[PDB]
From a paper:
To understand the molecular basis of DNA recognition by BANP, we solved the crystal structure of the BEN domain of BANP in complex with 12-bp palindromic CGCG-containing DNA with a cytosine overhang at the 5′ end at a resolution of 2.6 Å. In detail, the long C-terminal helix α5 of the BEN domain is mainly responsible for DNA recognition, as it inserts deeply into the CGCG-containing major groove and makes close contacts with its neighbouring bases and the phosphate–sugar backbones of the target DNA. Sequence-specific interactions for the target DNA could only be observed for G8 from one strand and T9′ from the complementary strand, in which the bases form hydrogen bonds with Arg316 and Ser313 from α5 of the BEN domain, respectively. Overall, the BANP BEN domain contacts the target DNA over a 6-bp footprint, with the C-terminal α5 inserted inside the major groove and with α2 and the loop between α3 and α4 holding both rims of the major groove. BANP binding slightly distorts the target DNA by narrowing the major groove it inserts into, which is different from NACC1, which slightly widens the major groove it binds. When the CGCG motif is recognized by two BEN domains simultaneously, the combined effects of recognition by two arginines from opposite directions of the double-stranded DNA result in compression of the CGCG motif.
There are nine BEN domain-containing proteins in humans, including BANP, BEND2–7, NACC1 and NACC2. Over the past few years, studies have demonstrated the preferred DNA sequences for some human BEN domain proteins, which can be roughly classified into two groups based on their recognized motifs. In this study, we solved the crystal structures of DNA-bound BEN domains from both BANP and NACC1, which are representative members of each group of BEN domain proteins.
Residue numbers in the entry:
A (entry chain A), C (entry chain B): 205 to 324
B (entry chain D): 207 to 324
D (entry chain C): 205 to 325
DNA sequence: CATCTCGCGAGAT
DNA sequence: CATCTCGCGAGAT
């Protein structure tokens, strides 16, 4: 996978630290949405699920998960943006490998519920 | 975050001597001094700052998040950031306080929604 | 903005209640002019616009509005004076927040009349 | 009741400050159970919901809330017991009245889900 | 499932 | 009225 550049969402925001091209991804979140996100998410857990709601439509979340495998045709949550969220969580919160694993189980859990309600 | 030129003759929410905790706003200085004089608590200043910053028609269709059963719009996050910056810089409120103040703001918009349905 | 003191208009008058310094502005209106105003304006609406004609020249009213923003180079009507006008209407009439809103539209509407005719 | 006596549950346990007769309530939690609570509940928020389950059966929780006032004809969780929970969480975590307030919505929300299962089974 | 926390209408100050 | 704060159902974690 390849990183991107500002020209990919000129009206967007950087996930990660803008200073480190090795660990930064541009995304479509406009700055005011990010102001709100960075204001109301006091843990890496809650900002990871919130960034997700802001980057993956729940139509997509219902048919997707991290690995793109599993029953019922699970597609794969776009990897450039998943790299973005990890870049951001480590930038803002300094998460560990232990942490990222839990955040990955909750990302998948959230997509599981999005699928759960296209069922009902 | 905005610059002063966004409202040449407006006012600053928050600390003017902190470019990260200040939001230029359209409140005229006349009115701001009145807000600083006759709003002696964070809770009242929040609800009256709200009315100087958002028409009651925006308030009716809006809540703090944009989520909700009602297809609601979201109160401009730059302005809400300034409300918050200002309440910190004058009353020095905690985030617990800020949390409970924030429920009052949803509550106000929610009664605005009620009136708009009458 | 900063309140003034009596020494700013010794032959002037006080807008507001003279007893708390935090809600009184000294203005240049002579007391005789003030006697005519209080006897002749039986509403805050009417007194605000009459007060305005006594503190802002029509020259100035035509160029200005309350925001100092808008089209055609609006200048901001002096805030200390505006603070005084509202200090006065709450002293004499007890106006509410809703009331102050319409009166601000009146003041601005009246500034529009002064500008429309400056170039008729 | 009024701040009960230890004879009310001779072989039970104390909620709160044992050497403070106004901030202690005697309850029927057996001592092995209380030890388990003291060991495995590491926060006031979990201790409250866990204590709830040891002092009120599910069927009581279903038709109860903290105040007794509700759109439904609810009953009130025995205020003496709720006092003890409160005394306890403060005795062993030094919780704020702000905390107690938020913890008390958690209690009310738990009984609310107990209501939900009773009508789903 | 247990628990947290939300948006909500409407009763209380 | 304007504002506080409640009980609630249910989504989020």
């Amino acid at each position: 996978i390849t990183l991107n550049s500002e020209e990919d969402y000129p009206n967007g925001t950087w996930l990660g630290d803008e200073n480190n091209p090795e660990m930064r991804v541009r995304c479509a979140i406009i700055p005011s949405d990010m102001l709100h996100i960075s204001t109301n998410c006091r843990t890496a857990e809650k900002m990871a699920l919130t960034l997700l709601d802001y980057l993956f439509h729940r139509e997509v979340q219902a048919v997707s998960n991290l690995s793109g495998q599993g029953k019922h045709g699970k597609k794969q949550l776009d990897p450039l943006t998943i790299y973005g969220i990890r870049c951001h969580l480590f930038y803002k919160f300094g998460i560990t490998e232990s942490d990222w694993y839990r955040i990955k189980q909750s990302i998948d859990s959230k997509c599981r519920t999005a699928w759960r309600r296209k069922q009902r």
